[PDB]
Design a protein around this ligand. Sequence first.
Ligand SMILES: [Mg+2]
Ligand SMILES: [Mg+2]
Ligand SMILES: [Mg+2]
Ligand SMILES: [Mg+2]
Ligand SMILES: [Mg+2]
Ligand SMILES: [Mn+2]
Ligand SMILES: [Mn+2]
Ligand SMILES: [Mn+2]
Ligand SMILES: [Mn+2]
Ligand SMILES: [Mn+2]
Ligand SMILES: [Mn+2]
Ligand SMILES: [Mn+2]
Ligand SMILES: [Mn+2]
Ligand SMILES: [Mn+2]
Ligand SMILES: [Mn+2]
Lengths: 372, 372, 372, 372, 372
Amino acid sequence: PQPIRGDKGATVKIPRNIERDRQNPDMLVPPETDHGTVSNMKFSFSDTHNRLEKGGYAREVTVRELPISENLASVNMRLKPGAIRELHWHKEAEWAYMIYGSARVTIVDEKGRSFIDDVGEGDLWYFPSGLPHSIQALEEGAEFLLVFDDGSFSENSTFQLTDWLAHTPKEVIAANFGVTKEEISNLPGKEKYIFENQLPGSLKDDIVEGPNGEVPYPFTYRLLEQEPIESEGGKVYIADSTNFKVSKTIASALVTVEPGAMRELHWHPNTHEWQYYISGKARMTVFASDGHARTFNYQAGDVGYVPFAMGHYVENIGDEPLVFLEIFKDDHYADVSLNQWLAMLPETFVQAHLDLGKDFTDVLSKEKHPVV
Amino acid sequence: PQPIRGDKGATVKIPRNIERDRQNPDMLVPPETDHGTVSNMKFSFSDTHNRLEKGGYAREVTVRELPISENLASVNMRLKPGAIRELHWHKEAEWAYMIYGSARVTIVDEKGRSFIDDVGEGDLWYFPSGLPHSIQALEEGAEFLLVFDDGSFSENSTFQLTDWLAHTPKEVIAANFGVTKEEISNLPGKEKYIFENQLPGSLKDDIVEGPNGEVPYPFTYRLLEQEPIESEGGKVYIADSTNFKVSKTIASALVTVEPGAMRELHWHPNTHEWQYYISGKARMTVFASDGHARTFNYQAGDVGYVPFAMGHYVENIGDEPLVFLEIFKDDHYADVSLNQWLAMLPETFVQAHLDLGKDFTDVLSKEKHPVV
Amino acid sequence: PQPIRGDKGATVKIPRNIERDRQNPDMLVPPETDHGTVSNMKFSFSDTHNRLEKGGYAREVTVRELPISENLASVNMRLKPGAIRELHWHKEAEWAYMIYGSARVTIVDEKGRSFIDDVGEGDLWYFPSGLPHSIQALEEGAEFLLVFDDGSFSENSTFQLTDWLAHTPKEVIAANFGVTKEEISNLPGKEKYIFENQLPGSLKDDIVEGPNGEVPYPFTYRLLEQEPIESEGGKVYIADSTNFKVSKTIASALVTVEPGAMRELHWHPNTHEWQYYISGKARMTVFASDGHARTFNYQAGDVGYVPFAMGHYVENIGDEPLVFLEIFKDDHYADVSLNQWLAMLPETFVQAHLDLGKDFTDVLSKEKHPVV
Amino acid sequence: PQPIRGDKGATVKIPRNIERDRQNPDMLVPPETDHGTVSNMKFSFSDTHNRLEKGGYAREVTVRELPISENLASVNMRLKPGAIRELHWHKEAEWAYMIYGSARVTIVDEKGRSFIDDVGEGDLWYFPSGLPHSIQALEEGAEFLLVFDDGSFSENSTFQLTDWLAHTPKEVIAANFGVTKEEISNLPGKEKYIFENQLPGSLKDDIVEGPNGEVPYPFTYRLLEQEPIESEGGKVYIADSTNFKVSKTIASALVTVEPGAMRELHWHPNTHEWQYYISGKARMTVFASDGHARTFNYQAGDVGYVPFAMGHYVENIGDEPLVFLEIFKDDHYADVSLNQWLAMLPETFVQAHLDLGKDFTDVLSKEKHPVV
Amino acid sequence: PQPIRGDKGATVKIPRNIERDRQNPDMLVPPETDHGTVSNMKFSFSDTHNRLEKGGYAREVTVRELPISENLASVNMRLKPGAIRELHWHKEAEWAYMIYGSARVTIVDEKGRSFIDDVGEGDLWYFPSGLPHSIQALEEGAEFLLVFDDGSFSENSTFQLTDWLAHTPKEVIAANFGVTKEEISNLPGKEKYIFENQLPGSLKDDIVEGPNGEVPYPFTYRLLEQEPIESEGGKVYIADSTNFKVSKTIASALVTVEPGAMRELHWHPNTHEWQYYISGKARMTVFASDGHARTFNYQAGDVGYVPFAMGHYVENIGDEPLVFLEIFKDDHYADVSLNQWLAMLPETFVQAHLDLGKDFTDVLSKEKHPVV
Ligand SMILES: [Mg+2]
Ligand SMILES: [Mg+2]
Ligand SMILES: [Mg+2]
Ligand SMILES: [Mg+2]
Ligand SMILES: [Mg+2]
Ligand SMILES: [Mn+2]
Ligand SMILES: [Mn+2]
Ligand SMILES: [Mn+2]
Ligand SMILES: [Mn+2]
Ligand SMILES: [Mn+2]
Ligand SMILES: [Mn+2]
Ligand SMILES: [Mn+2]
Ligand SMILES: [Mn+2]
Ligand SMILES: [Mn+2]
Ligand SMILES: [Mn+2]
């Protein structure tokens, strides 16, 4: 491939990364309509350090990797069968999508109520900031995407149970529980983070009963069970605080785009959009106002971003289905469709703007079709 | 005029701007009670660049002009008869007051519901952040004041319909609507922003029906229709989220002060006050605490500002009525009257503070009179 | 005392402050488990400038003294019998705890409604931001702790009644009230702030009736009247917006820890904790995640702080009861108990984490006991 | 005047400030070539609060008035005959230009060396940061422009001699000088700032001799004595650290533009330009790159600004001479002339850029002519 | 490849980017010694938008792509034979390395002196901030790396000649040069940026003579002509202000590492290191102190970064030579070699630190060998 478009551009003369150029066709050779300075809106998990542990791994994309995403950060975590992500808590709220396998999660709220449940492929969970939780993969192991509502998410964001105890005077721990220092002499000297463990038993056998009762709302959500918004070119599954009650700071949508289809031109009137590409290949042009626009390519891993109110679309440029997540730090999902917008205005008024005739306004639809 | 007060000050000896000195009597010669460093709280639209277009003009006062106003910015827009302010949207919420003429506005919400209505002198509109809208002046043309809830409002805040399409690949636009590239070959190459157009027909003929139903609440408000708070020296018309339902981030008040009257000494316990002087001449002293106070003069255009909780009053120093707007970035209007405050406390307690007698406390009123 | 722990440390060889070293046993000789850089979380009112006035005094601990506390600041105020803290208002909300004596407070809201009441030892008050108020000590005088919801609280935060009038043109004041300049010639030339005054009469005689009616909710709260959460080692009295209705930005808890007891290991899932030590002596280790932890000593005065979500405990290390306040800038109090958390999880799962057996999990309690 | 240019713009329909519109012809009706968002680069001293004292006055334009000027602030000070600007010092360096009258200044350096001298119209002075100084007007009184090298210049920037003593324990002052508290009982209770005083005697009689010798370099500079750069349309007098040795942080140029002339198109490769218009009327277009440019009008007072490297010119649009100051926070003056730049490049290369022929390149001059 | 190291890690179960994983062996499977949160220190030009023009292209890596690099930004520019990078200037200083081909550059300083010269492969140029310049490729075309001393480098950083004129009133341009508006009617309406042009003639024929004389120092430097520091595993060519006189804000080093060799363990005691990989493949571990370290992989394009004082090395992990640039925003190059450091200390002292014997200290060298 060469950076040539018509009579513009030229061949690359210096040593280059041909493999990456092939993955970014629309960046090596952008649309003629691209223009102006626009921040980077793409980053691959494959370009991050992978923390390997006995029991799995974890890699992250944060504001230190993708500066534009100051409000959201993400971790791609993998657990082997039975492996446990140590009991912990953080300052940020946590949202997750199970891509592969399954796992059992636990969480106890500020009123001493516990919630334990199994999560499979296509399911989500949301843990409010500060509430302690854990994850343990089941027989197939597990690999999921975590999203935290602070782009600065880092090592100083998470508190591990064993790390806390390892840094608390033995005499204080003893006094706190009413035991002797000798009885807790075997406590770990360092945190575990992720550790191998035998597979757990049936969920029903793990349920713990308490004097505080059951939690008011579930911390897990079966996203694929609900009926999706079905368009001619694909489908959209949405989960925000209106249906997944506890998810107050994260609204999400799983979008599937068939080959030859595209997520239509639209924008979000509420907040920034954070994206994760599960599978497939795509291209998206972000319109940043005042004649500024830049096109980006995305595939598999890849994290994407669309700043608040910027116009965009997501086109499948591959032969396989395109599947990605749209994440928003808000209590609801909201979007404005270009097609629907114009369809709901007087025909001659739209014609006056576009210098087009009735032949164009005749194709506008008053019904919203997310994927065409 | 000379900067002389009693035995203080002196005549100006260097070349000067006599015209401006005449407009700022209380700045050239401030009250003896003024003291300390206080930020500038005044700026004139006449001191800004006027963007002229075929169909009208627009000038703005932002944080780049008035640094103290970081949360609110304003645009003075003028449209000729039939002229259209191109379909667009922005990150900020928009509030407006029609000073002269009338116009038809359109807006479509995130659920595909449209609202179209005509706005006349004394009417307002409020467009939630991110929702697309337009303005088209009627037979008398129109001139209004726009207020956006972010002082950094600029060119990167607004997204124009034709600018978006002009910066989107033709093949993508074609695919989005299901037409050929040839059918959209006549789309504008650049945005229009403001453009001349034939006057529209009757409002009833423009109303568009849709499968999503009518909007829950109107985006326009007839401010002058309601009964105002009538005081001995003037009247106050208030519009906040309690009566103009959709206006959640902007609370407003239209104040009219007759000659020889004044908006009484008061402060706002909720947020900063942004002002626009429609007509007349005035002076206001802002009390910034810790013995700091500065007096400013205002007239016609002029934008004013009163930081959160600072004490102030607005005195008419002219022969004609004084008319101005008080704007607040909040979901409600709130103020504390000095008179009412003292009137609601034990008489001897107030006397103990002011070193004054019953003769003074006897004039205090338990009823609030905004303009005396 | 010497900074020696086992074979670590050494004797101090340079001139030193032995008195302070004696007050900070756990800082001169920290637990072996302390580690890493942790910001200072302690400051004494005795290390601040005391503003002395005719009628009392006031000293403060703000972000300029304790940098970690950016959201909360405090003032220790003392009033002699009958002394008045001048009518004033500020940008910040104000919360208070009467430690000694009693006082009468007044406050008028934005609707012209007044609230006057007497506050005794153990009582609280909360004045919403911007609402004018006053304090006048009764026959025993008064000494209380004030907490403002902005760590930057300073001189530019408070507006005094007489200071406002002293910096307002006489002709404007006259016009505002409808009197002559001669009638207000005796107004103070400078603010009073705190001034001596004769003791007031009975509360019932001070109550002012108005055309706006009574306030919807009281601005004072009798904290010690309610039944506290009683544990084996002490008690906790909580006051947040769920019971003390008007206190929307401040949640509080008065904790009493008997000798030999401790506020258990816990953390707050909602926000930072600000502390004030009323009496006694203690030590607290703050766990800041990622193997970081630091221990601090506190006594009498002393202000403490625990950043959001950090693990902590408060142990009484003296022979007398330990009494302190836990303050949070939020509309509710919330905490997660380490004991309760583990008690509500499957036993073998906890055992897998701690490398401990049934003997340990058997002591866990599903009921929360704040002080053990 | 009306905001109309050809077929663009329209008449103003709302109440307006006709006087200011007349002063800003190029802002009400900007050049067709103006475009994009550009910060405000103009502010009038007449729009500022004038501090009046017994002996003169002072008004300032700081970053609180003109946000773009973060590195430089200015004060317009006026002193009556014999009046003294109290002995003081500040954190910022101070540069000055005597516009009217004359004054005697004093300054003592960190080595105890004193410098006393008289300054007349056209003379300058530069006081390094932190060095104490004073100003006393002579028989004609004085009015000058002060420039400080920090845009945040305010009340907290200046330390007055009597204010320091007024806030130092009497016993400490006594001990410091070896006198009794009784001997200093008459010290002022408050600062003087500016105060009336009898005219001083001859300069030679005020010169103080010391054991530390004379200062290495003078703190005053006779700008108009040197030969200026004389062009066909005016002249330029430059004073920077290369000729006015002590002026290390301020470089200056006094520019005079005859009617029908203009300061040529140029830019500064070193730093931002701060301007003060002494007399006349002008217009300047600032080119901010990327197709952004805005035109401003200036007259008498007025402060102007040109951010670092932006292209500009200053055209006299009046019938009288245009006189202004160009100030730079740097140790040298530097500029690049558009004409000279192109004149020093191959002719065909310039022709290739401008699409113009030899007829144009033939008029280019290799010699720099600041004012044409 | 799989993220597995011994008994740590696991196979990837979700869709992935195998191509990128293959390019980042040490990121997918980091050294066991890596630990802690470390910012991203790598970015590929292939992952950026390529601006294509008639005559070449340009792509950039700025702080918007690589957040850690706040002080330096870079552009990879390509010019076809004879193509011109339009006459322009910027706020930032510019440094360049010619990787392929050759070009003629022009620059005029603030004294009207011009410098024109040809630059070939291995040559550099440095243009001080604000000084106008141009680049025109010769018969082979050209491709080079530009480095600007501000990470925020963007569109608002560069001023183009034709863009300035296009946004300046025609009447002003006419007056500035003494021509009629008609004579300049053919000036471009928009900037050119990069445009095709006929190849220039011999350099000697382009040299322009002026009344200001020759520039004091050359703006170009033949880096490969000088004798490099030759080590056993490679060579280092250094150019800083001590030899390339005008390059005051950029110090550089071209490093060549043979297969099986490595840039030794070292750190820089002066400032941050910015890197560009010309050819080959490598891996570098950055030691960030306090037990934090992260390994990164680099190849062809790729930009790297090493924050101030962090320890590092650069190992060739390929079969071909590794060639990269080390750039520093400082007036000199400086480094501390771990080997040399220990070699210059008492043997037993080093042994006491490392718990190693004479066998190790015996291999230390007092001479610095950059590449081993
Ligand atoms: Mg464009
Ligand atoms: Mg005062
Ligand atoms: Mg440790
Ligand atoms: Mg333009
Ligand atoms: Mg380690
Ligand atoms: Mn988690
Ligand atoms: Mn979207
Ligand atoms: Mn709008
Ligand atoms: Mn008000
Ligand atoms: Mn208070
Ligand atoms: Mn706590
Ligand atoms: Mn001074
Ligand atoms: Mn200039
Ligand atoms: Mn350049
Ligand atoms: Mn290095």
